[PDB]
Design a protein around this ligand. Structure first.
Ligand SMILES: COc1ccc(-c2ccc(CN(C(=O)c3cc(C(=O)O)c(C(=O)O)cc3C(=O)O)[C@H]3CCCc4ccccc43)cc2)cc1
Lengths: 72, 72, 72
């Protein structure tokens, strides 16, 4: 939730900067760089999707505690 | 659920591609890249591990929201 | 160390390897690589922060379950 979106905001922008630098370095170094940014993109996309799953559970318990508080 | 698995599968696929391409430059060249690849290999295994742990905490939201109907 | 923290620990130990490799090879490679070394640490930090939220939800579920089981 909250902190994860702020760390996403910083990390995504820095990953997009590495993709920008790849689109300015198109063979100016190892071909691996077009695979490294693409790996970091796929790793980032897992964190970006976890932002919803690790929100469903987290707001899950913050709703469920208020249902328990109707009888506790 | 089906989405996070696709992102993990794609990150696993692209890690297998990145490690294979690192093997293709057999010896010297960038050097530094032999640490970059192994970072994302460890990040991939760590993202896998918390995506496995995700299921157990998701099953606990399912268990809680079901058994709250036995509290009253 | 659970499962999770061993991969994060070996990733963390790899950042010290990748930073000393970047400090040694500071005058060779694509400029992209000096942004990757920092951005993959922001990915590690996001994985660790998400792991701390996985700890918070699975703790949360036990604290909710202790209250649900006192009335069910
Ligand atoms: C009685 O049972 C429980 C009550 C509350 C919680 C619970 C769950 C998660 C959080 C974490 N959290 C939230 O989930 C959160 C809490 C609130 C709120 O309670 O005021 C709000 C809000 O209502 O705006 C928004 C968030 C969020 O991140 O989306 C924030 C606030 C604390 C600092 C922090 C650090 C890193 C990431 C997130 C968080 C805390 C307690 C668990 C069991």
């Amino acid at each position: 939730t909250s902190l994860i979106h702020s760390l996403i905001e910083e990390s995504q922008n820095q990953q997009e900067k590495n993709e920008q630098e790849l689109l300015e370095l198109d063979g100016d170094g190892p071909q691996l760089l077009s695979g490294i940014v693409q790996q970091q993109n796929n790793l980032l996309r897992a964190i970006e999707a976890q932002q919803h799953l690790l929100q469903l559970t987290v707001w899950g318990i913050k709703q469920l505690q208020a249902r328990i508080l109707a009888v506790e």
